[PDB]
Every structure is written in C-alpha cells, then in structure tokens.
Design a protein around this nucleic acid. Structure first.
Lengths: 50, 63, 97, 226, 127, 25
RNA sequence: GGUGAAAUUCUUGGAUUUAUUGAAGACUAACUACUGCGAAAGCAUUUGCCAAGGACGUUUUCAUUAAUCAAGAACGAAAGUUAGGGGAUCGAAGAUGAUCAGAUACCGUCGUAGUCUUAACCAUAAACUAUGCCGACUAGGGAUCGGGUGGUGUUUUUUUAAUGACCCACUCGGCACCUUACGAGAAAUCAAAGUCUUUGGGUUCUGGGGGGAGUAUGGUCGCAAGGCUGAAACUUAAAGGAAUUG
C-alpha cells in the first residue's frame, strides 16, 4: 500500500507485489522486506517434523 | 554331468491340469533307502529305473 | 428369513464383541463370528525329518513344532476350502468329525 | 532377482575371514559348562579396540547346553560379554527366556492362565523384572471340562506370588538366584503355598531383565571365574 | 569340540532369507536370499531358491570352518502373515543333506500382544 | 438405486434448496 | 520390495538384514468359550482409592408404597465439527504404478484430514435377538455362571483341624442349549413367536397397498453437518413375505 519509494512492494495501479517475497539471506539492508531465508511457504499441513 | 539313477517304487497319482503328468515315490539306488517324491511326464510303471539330473527336490503339485 | 439361529456367530448377553482381522484379506470381523482354527504343525513337514535326525548335534531331539491359532474370514475360508457349504439339515452339526 | 538391479552403487579386497580373529567364551561358576562357545571379531587394530567392541555383546544359549539336561532344555540364558582375558573371555548373567514353542504348547483353553510381574531389587545392587506363569487344572475326581477360577483366587495368587518373589530376591544375590532358578524350587514353593487354593499345575517362571546393574567389578567377575 | 553358529532364517512370503552368524550375532556370515539365487520376481520365494542359498552358505560356512548351527526360525508376524514360506523347510532340508550339524531349533516370529494396526482396509484386500 | 445413495442425492439436493432460498431471502 | 504376474519406490551414500540400547504413540493377542457384568451403547494387564449393583442367605424392618407411560429429562458405537495438545501405525481425499476398450474403482507405493486425548457439541446405526415392559400357567432332558443347603463323600497343608478346590443331590436367580410339537403360525420356524373365531390378565408405542416421501412447508434443536415433528398433489395393480420344482 506504500509507494515504491517507501518500500519494495509499493506502487502499481493494483496492489500487487510483482517480485517474489522470498528473500535471500545474503540480501542487504533495504531489500530484506518479506520472507527471509525461507525454505517453504504457504499453509503447512502435517508436522513440524523434529 | 553327475546324475543320480533312482527307481520309482510307488506312483502317487496323476496331476497336471490335463492329466499329462504324475507324482511318484522314487528310491535312490546309490545311497539306498534315500527316498524322494517327484514328478514324471511320460508313461511309467512300477519298479521303473530313471535318471535324475538332481536329487534335492520334491514338487508338491501343479496345475 | 433368519438363515440361522445364532446369525453365524456367538453373541448372547453381550451386544458387542471386539473385532478380529483375517490373514488373507485382513477383514475386520468379530471373534465369535470368525473361522478360528488351530495350526499345530511340525516345523519340518515330515520330509527332512530323517536328514535332520541323522545330522543332529544331539540325538533323541524333540524336534518341536509351530503352535498358533488362525483366524479366518468367511470369504477367504470358503475360498481356501477350509470349510465348505452345507445342506440345510447339516448346517447344525456344531461339532466336527 | 539375480539380474534385476538398476544400480548397485549410486556412489558412482581383502578376505574378512583373514581379517577376523577367533575368541572363546566361558560361563560363570553357576553353570557347569564353563566353556560354552566361540565367536569372531576383526583384528584389534589400535583404531577399534576389539576388546570393547566385543564387550558390547550378549549370547543366548540353552540350559540343556550348559547342564546336559533335556528337562532344562526349555530355558535359555542370555549371558553378557563382561570380561575378556586373552581369548578365554568370560561372561555374566543378562537374562532368562523360555522357548515360544514351549509356551505355545502349555497355553491352551478350557483352563485358566495366571500371570504376575514384579520389578524388584536384589541384595547385590541389580534391579530385575521377573514374571511368573501359572495354570489351572482339572482336579482328580473332577468331571468338568474347563476348571475356571473365580478371580479372587487369582488376585490372591498374584499377591502371594509377588511377595514370594520380593522375599527371595531381597536376600539372594545374583548367583544365588541362578542357583535356585536352575532347579525351580520356587514353583514348588508356590504349589505348597497354594494347594489349599487350587491344584495349580504348570507354574513356571518368566523373563527377567536387568534394568540397571552396579559397576562391573572385574574383581567380582574374576572371583566368580576363579 | 564342535564350533557352533546360528542359522537366523526369516521365511516371509515372497522371500525366504537365511543368514548365519556367531552365537552373539554381530559376527555376521554370508547372508543370502532366494532372489540372490534365482531370477523370477515371483520365484523370489521359491523353495528351490531357498535350498540353493542353503547349499551356497553351507559352502561358505564349511570353508570358513563352522561345524554346527543352532537354528532360529522367524516369520513376518507383527501385523503380517505370521506363518512361514516354503523356503523354511527347503533350507533346513538342504543343510541337513549338506551335512552341517543341527541344534536347538526355535521359532521367534514376532507374535505381538495387542498390536498396532492391521493394514489393508477394514473391508479387506478385495483381490 | 441403492437407498443410501438415494439419500445422499436427496441431501445434496436439499442443501442446494437451502442455499438458493437463502440467496432469494 | 510388492503382486496373479508385474511395475511405481529403497539399495557402494550399504539398503533389506542380524546384535545392543533408545524415543513416540496406539494396542491389552494367546487364556477367549452356545462363559461374565452393564438400562443400552459397551466393557479384557497389574495395583491402589471412589462410591455403586444383581442374585443369594435372612423366623430383620415399613407396609400397598406398585406396573406401564404422552409430556418432560439422563446416557447414547463409529463418523463429523470447535480450539488446544498429541500425532507412531492405519488411512476418506489426492498423486502415482499399473490392469482395462475406457478405470480419478478394485490390487500396489506414498500420503493430508482423521485415528488417541482434555473442555464443549452432534443425538444417529442392520443403535438387530429386525422379537416392548410387568405378571401367571403349561412337555421333557442335560449342560453351565453366581449364591446357598445337605451329604463320615474325595483331594489339599501338620497323615489328619479349619478353610479352600473337587464329587453327589437339591435349591433361587442369570447367558443360552438338545429334543418334541400338545399348542401356534401363511411358511421358515417358536418354550414362546404358546395358554387367540371355544376370540378380554395390565399397560405403552407404532402400521393400514405400492411409490411420491421420510419429500415440501411450518415450527424446533444444533456452529454447521444435520436431527425431531412431518403432509398433499400426482401416479400405479400390483410391489412384497415364505416355501416347492425347474
């Protein structure tokens, strides 16, 4: 909902992210908005498995 | 090709789904009193010698 | 109609019986209804007896056997020829030969 | 299947018989056949210490094997690898077990089974779980087919059994237990306690599991293996 | 006098495994199976293949130096069929006629009290 | 047809009546 | 490894396998039966505690307090729902091996929900013995569980007392059973499904050809799934039960 100056999702005539939110751990300060160093996403169904 | 010569001493009965074979009790001559029960294809009768390419088998049945 | 008097089972004064599984199909069937038999079979099957006796480290060896109960379902029992169907007059022989 | 495998090695000789050495294992003082058997192990390089790698073991052998007696045939003793002295290595007790064929023979219907369990400590710092199996029987002069008990008889049998167990093991050390279980006098103790309850045949013992021993005490083991 | 191993048979349907080891067990010797002997995926359980493996492991055990064996028969048990395949009888016949000595035959099939769950649906295996 | 599946067909039909009448009301 | 046979899949990174331990959860085999208890659902290790119950024994007590029941309340398998836990096997769905003319069906390997449990809901089942509850009378026989009585009965410790476990006989109450068929019924069959056209011991609940339809609506309960109550129009001459021969 912000503007693209104010965030890496902001902007667009439609509220949409555009570029995928799963961010490398070796990204930087300014890029680390979103899901960081993530291995999987979405709804988990089952077990923590540990 | 070491085979064993053994003699049918009893015929158990016919088998195959089509009567084409039989089951027989056969005594080894070498190492006498060592019995076996095994199968045969052709016409056979009592007292009948037969070569066997092995000793160590007894097929129970077949269709 | 009621083909039987006990409906193929034995439930009197229970209302419920814990189930049992078959061994071919593994169908969940009660116990009173099942086709429990008992297998008591020499491990050696009567063929290798001479060889094992002569080759025993110990003679006068008991040569034990497998003892175990065998629960069967109606279907797999009849199919495996354990039991077979009986006339309307000889269904009632509640004992075997 | 002799020629089915699609890959034996996703990853991309010396004869172990020659790489292995023999060893000879002996029983304790509580069994007349001290020498009971042998075993194999890879040659004890300095990397492995075959002594300890073999120390971590146990062997089941039959009491008919260890006492010559086919009546003792139906009992098996697990003896633990506890000491090694130059390929004439020694053991000590680990645990009893019957033969399943014997059990499946004695179990039958138109009777009543009874089973008890105790988790009791001994005089000598071990802690053992023993069980006890007892059967009912048609009396002589009886005519009924089943001879089923009445469950209060059974609970009482359970109590008297369990207290007998605790009483014996609390005071009998390990070797004493072995020495009084090889004849199974305990069963006759049960029957003499209970013959004013039920005739009560087939009163055998059942498994026993060291739950925690004390220290090894190699001196004590050698005292047994004097 | 006579050195003793133990036979450790497992006579499952579709395969009758045999292997021999020391009295303790960790010293393992010459595990062989029917499928190791023969070809047909159905004949994995063949008593023919069972006795084949019996004679081959007999050769291995004679040339390593064992004399006798204490037999421990096992079957699937647990949840599964609980009864042996034909390879049991086959292999014991085989070793008997091979001449290695025999002792202490016993059945150790897992016959569990109060099992977990029998597979294959409630209705069964609708073959 | 089998009575159970007749029942299931009836139930699905019935809840569909439910939904449409909710839509109209 | 699986199968009828095969195949998906795992195996030099050592599977499969054997030995010694460990963890998680479920489960309570064999004994286990024409055997027990419970209103029913249902209930199977031990030990301890909580209160409860039937029958039995009673020359105890009160004294007709009782039976059956709309309304109305309690419990109520599985499945399923709500949030937590737990979460091994098994396994709706679904993916894949395939077989097949086709196969999202059978068989196979995976596998989420669930399966287990705490708190709260649901209120159904071939919840069947398809057989209401109370009472009485009537043919036999035997077996069995529990209690009790009698019997120098047997066996049991210290030969021997008790007690106990057996035997015999009897008894009351139970799960049921074998045979008859007087009796009944349309027949199968039944010790009640009898004592009913020689029609009546007491009470409750339900059915009136088949379908429509356990549908529609209206209430009512439930988060929902759904449940309880519950017609009509219209259509039709048969559907259906039990036995016989083929």
């Amino acid at each position: 909902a912000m503007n693209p100056v104010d965030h890496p999702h902001g902007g667009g005539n439609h509220q949409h992210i555009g570029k995928a939110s799963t961010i490398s751990r070796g990204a930087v300060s300014g890029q680390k908005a979103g899901l960081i160093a993530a291995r999987r996403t979405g709804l988990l169904r089952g077990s923590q498995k540990t | 090709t070491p085979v064993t010569l053994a003699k049918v001493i009893k015929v158990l009965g016919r088998t195959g789904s089509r009567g084409g074979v039989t089951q027989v009790r056969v005594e080894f001559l070498e190492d006498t009193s060592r019995t076996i029960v095994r199968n045969v294809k052709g016409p056979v009768r009592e007292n009948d010698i037969l070569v066997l390419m092995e000793s160590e088998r007894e097929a129970r049945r077949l269709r | 109609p009621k083909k039987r008097a006990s409906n193929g089972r034995n439930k009197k004064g229970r209302g419920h019986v814990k189930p049992v599984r078959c061994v071919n199909c593994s169908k969940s069937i009660p116990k009173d209804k099942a086709i429990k038999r008992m297998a008591i079979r020499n491990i050696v099957e009567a063929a290798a007896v001479r060889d094992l006796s002569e080759a025993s480290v110990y003679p006068e060896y008991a040569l034990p056997k497998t003892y175990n109960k065998l629960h069967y379902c109606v279907s797999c029992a009849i199919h495996a020829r354990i039991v077979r169907v009986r006339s309307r007059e000889d269904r009632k022989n509640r004992a075997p030969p | 299947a002799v020629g089915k495998n699609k890959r034996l090695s996703k990853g991309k000789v010396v004869d172990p018989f020659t790489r292995k050495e023999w060893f000879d294992i002996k029983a304790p003082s509580t069994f007349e056949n001290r020498n009971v058997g042998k075993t194999l192990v890879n040659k004890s390089t300095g990397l492995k210490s075959a002594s300890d790698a073999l120390k971590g073991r146990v062997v089941e052998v039959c009491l008919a094997d260890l006492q010559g007696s086919e009546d003792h045939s139906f009992r098996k003793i697990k003896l633990r690898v506890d000491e090694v002295q130059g390929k004439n290595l020694l053991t000590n007790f680990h645990g009893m077990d019957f033969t399943t064929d014997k059990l499946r023979s004695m179990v039958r219907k138109w009777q009543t089974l009874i089973e008890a369990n105790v988790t009791v400590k001994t005089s000598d710092d071990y802690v053992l779980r023993i069980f006890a199996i007892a059967f009912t029987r048609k009396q002589a002069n009886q005519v009924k087919r089943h001879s089923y008990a009445q469950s209060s008889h059974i609970r009482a049998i359970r109590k008297v059994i369990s207290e007998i167990l605790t009483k014996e093991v609390q005071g009998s050390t390990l070797a004493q237990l072995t020495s009084k279980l090889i004849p199974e006098v305990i069963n006759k103790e049960i029957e003499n306690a209970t013959k004013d309850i039920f005739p009560l045949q087939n009163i055998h013992v059942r498994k026993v599991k060291l739950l925690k021993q004390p220290k090894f005490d190699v001196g004590a083991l050698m005292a047994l293996h004097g | 006098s006579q050195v003793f191993g133990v036979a450790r048979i497992y006579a499952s349907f579709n395969d009758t495994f045999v292997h021999v080891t020391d009295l303790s067990g960790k010293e393992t010797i010459a595990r062989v199976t029917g499928g190791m002997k023969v070809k047909a995926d159905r004949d994995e359980s063949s008593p023919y293949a069972a006795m084949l493996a019996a004679q081959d492991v007999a050769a291995k055990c004679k040339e390593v130096g064992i004399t006798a064996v204490h037999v421990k028969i096992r079957a699937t048990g647990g949840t599964r069929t609980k009864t042996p395949g034909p390879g049991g009888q086959a292999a014991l016949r085989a070793l008997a006629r091979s001449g290695l000595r025999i002792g202490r035959i016993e059945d150790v099939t897992p016959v569990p009290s109060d099992s977990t769950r029998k597979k294959g649906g409630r209705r069964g295996r609708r073959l | 047809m089998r009575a159970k599946w007749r029942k299931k067909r009836t139930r699905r039909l019935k809840r569909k009546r439910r939904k449409v009448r909710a839509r109209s009301k």
